[PDB]
């Protein structure tokens, strides 16, 4: 009986400890998951903005290349015209 009372007491104490730790862990898990979702959304928006900017940059590169080639051709023709 004495041994059983000791075991019941210590087990009850440890169970209270474990349940409180579980409550803490669940709360922290919820908060961190919410923060993760927010950060993921931010990353997606940053990625799409960067992609759009890069596409526009590539188009500008192409256009400037074309106009430069036209300028070179016209310069050669101007020398010939002189």
């Amino acid at each position: 009986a004495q041994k059983d009372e000791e075991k019941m007491e210590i087990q009850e104490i440890q169970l209270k400890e474990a349940k409180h730790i579980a409550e803490d862990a669940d709360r922290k898990y919820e908060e961190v998951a919410r923060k993760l979702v927010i950060i993921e959304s931010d990353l997606e928006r940053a990625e799409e903005r960067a992609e759009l900017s890069e596409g526009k940059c590539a188009e500008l590169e192409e256009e400037l290349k074309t106009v430069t080639n036209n300028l070179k051709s016209l310069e050669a023709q101007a020398e010939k015209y002189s």
């Binding site: 192409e62 074309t66 080639n69 051709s73 023709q77």
Partner: protein, 375 residues
Amino acid sequence: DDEETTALVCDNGSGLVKAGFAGDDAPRAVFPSIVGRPRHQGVMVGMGQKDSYVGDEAQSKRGILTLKYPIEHGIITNWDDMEKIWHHTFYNELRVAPEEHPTLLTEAPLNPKANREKMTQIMFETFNVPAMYVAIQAVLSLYASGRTTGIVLDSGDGVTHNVPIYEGYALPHAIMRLDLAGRDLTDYLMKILTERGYSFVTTAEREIVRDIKEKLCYVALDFENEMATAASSSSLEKSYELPDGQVITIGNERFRCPETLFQPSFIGMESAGIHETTYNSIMKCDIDIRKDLYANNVLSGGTTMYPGIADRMQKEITALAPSTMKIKIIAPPERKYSVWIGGSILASLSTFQQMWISKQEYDEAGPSIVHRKCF
């Protein structure tokens, strides 16, 4: 705008349908003319999967479609698909019912009659337009340049035709129509890419090869010197990133693809290049208007947008032509939409307002009215 009635300047083309209301500077909606049925099975239920994606929608789902152009070489080979394309163009890209708008289609020279008659019959029976008129694709490109003479080389994507015009009087016996165009250049590029290891076979990958051709290829000023240079140095090798990675490097395929225009023997065609069919088209004209045609050579159409073609063509013609004449090649920066700009200008004219084929006239003479006085 408001009251009154504006005309629809549609331009079927072959590869890009360009449309918009008359009186503007640029077409309102430009989108590829492809209709692609899905080819796999499809397991998700209720996804809202349609049976045919047309226009620019099928250039985004092209991974699981089988795109097929409804216009082969100017002529129309699949009338149901062409009707679908027109219906899309009217209702979704412009959102104007055709019951209240005249239409101005465009047609290549020397095309089969049945194509034109079926086109007018469709426009009058299915879409039920008030009045439609069909115009030759080169006269419009001459309108857009603001000229009234000149010989225009309209190298589209389906067919390349070369209509000489003087003082507004077209010369019907000097039209030289050649069936080499952008599509054959795409196929030839797709065929010579296999010499490095890249194999494109699917009808969807033809679009990728077309993008490669548009962004990288250029016309060499002198072919043999470029072939010699590309075989020694490596200053030409430009790389390009596929839709999934695995960049590719194009060597002397860059100027060999569009060289087919000036040497149609590459794809096995017998005829002479676009540099010599223009000179032949000029020489068929009378002896007194050859100087004006030499001085006012006009370029149009999409395929004439290669970087460095306005110099190669001038060099070739100067080699062929007599040494005294001055050879000038008009290459406006708005080459691609030149035909449509000219179409808008023509539809906006007051003198032209009584040339439309009114519906009552069609009801009295049938579809064969188009060959009659209302051309």
